[PDB]
Amino acid sequence: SYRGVDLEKLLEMSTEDFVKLAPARVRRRFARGMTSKPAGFMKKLRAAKLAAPENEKPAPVRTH
Amino acid sequence: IIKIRITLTSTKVKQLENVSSNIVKNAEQHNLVKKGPVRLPTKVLKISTRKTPNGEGSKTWETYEMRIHKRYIDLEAPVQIVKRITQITIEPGVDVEVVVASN
């Protein structure tokens, strides 16, 4: 509920208007650069995600 | 037969009045049109650096200097007159340039 919105806006709203409801730095840090190898957590976050009962553990990878 | 322009920007002031004299010498033995050697304001370089290799001691500094003098002459002559005389006024440390800018 940033803008008085539904606080359950979890899968329905994408990453793009996620930036729209946000302050200025990530409103610049959005087209800041198309990361590939620093976009390597997200290729491995989905490698272990949501395959569990209530309350999980992700697959963390050593990063910077 | 074209108006030309010569520049010379050196750093040995004794070895720039011999060159600028023999430039106007052999031109006036052939009596071309000319304008005198215009002498520009000189340029000085400087860098302050303190005087210790380590840092332990009292503090005041140095100041180094380097002086650049530059003067230039405009000229007009037939090309056969000038293309020989610009090759016999060489001297180390001295730079010579020819500009034929006639826009």
């Binding site: - | 750093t11 200097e65 380097m66």
Partner: protein, 37 residues
């Protein structure tokens, strides 16, 4: 760069020569710098 004499800091970035200033006082002669005042 670290040039020579225990220095990668205090480099003289001006005038495009890039010398460690510990190793400038002994090279400032033959470059053609001299002190006068």
């Amino acid at each position: 760069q670290c040039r020579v004499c225990s220095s990668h800091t205090g480099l003289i970035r001006k005038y495009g020569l890039n010398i460690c200033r510990q190793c400038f006082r002994e090279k400032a002669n033959d470059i053609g710098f001299n002190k006068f005042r």
